[PDB]
Amino acid sequence: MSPYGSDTTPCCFAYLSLALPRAHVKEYFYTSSKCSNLAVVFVTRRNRQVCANPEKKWVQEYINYLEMS
Amino acid sequence: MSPYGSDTTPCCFAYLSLALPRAHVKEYFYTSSKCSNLAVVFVTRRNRQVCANPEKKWVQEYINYLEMS
């Protein structure tokens, strides 16, 4: 437990019109609530995370695909 | 290297006047360049990081102390 919650917080704002194939992605995640902008963090099969804003339809498609698969 | 980057940025904007003693900290560090605010991340002896803006004297002293020790 950390009594002091004023620590390093993962935040991000990015997007990509050409998203990596769904076969390379493992799952999706959302940026910290501390972030002024809510973004989606895709975790690849290589466990490498990337940030993309949910307003991109590809992100929606990938989220919709990863939520069902 | 990553041809496709833009991922979670460890950022922070906080401070604490009642900071933990130098015996509780191991070292200091700076926030990522993607951060809109430069902050200092202190790494405790428990591998727990914490942030504090360098504008605080405690941070300056701890930086000056941790840079030498």
From Swiss-Prot, chains A, B:
Bridged cysteine pairs (disulfide): C11-C35, C12-C51
Principal location listed in the UniProt entry: secreted
Tissue: T-cell and macrophage specific.
Cellular component GO terms, alphabetical: cytoplasm; extracellular space
Keyword Secreted: yes
Subcellular location: Secreted
GO molecular function: CCR1 chemokine receptor binding; CCR5 chemokine receptor binding; chemoattractant activity; chemokine activity; chemokine receptor antagonist activity; phosphatidylinositol-4,5-bisphosphate phospholipase C activity; phospholipase activator activity; protein homodimerization activity
GO biological process: calcium ion transport; cell-cell signaling; cellular response to fibroblast growth factor stimulus; cellular response to interleukin-1; cellular response to tumor necrosis factor; cellular response to type II interferon; cellular response to virus; chemokine (C-C motif) ligand 5 signaling pathway
Keywords: Chemotaxis, Cytokine, Disulfide bond, Inflammatory response, Secreted, Signal
Primary role: Chemoattractant for blood monocytes, memory T-helper cells and eosinophils. Causes the release of histamine from basophils and activates eosinophils. May activate several chemokine receptors including CCR1, CCR3, CCR4 and CCR5. May also be an agonist of the G protein-coupled receptor GPR75. Together with GPR75, may play a role in neuron survival through activation of a downstream signaling pathway involving the PI3, Akt and MAP kinases. By activating GPR75 may also play a role in insulin secretion by islet cells.
Family named by the database record: Belongs to the intercrine beta (chemokine CC) family.
Protein name: C-C motif chemokine 5
Organism, scientific name: Mus musculus (Mouse)
Residues included from the entire protein: 24 to 91 of 91
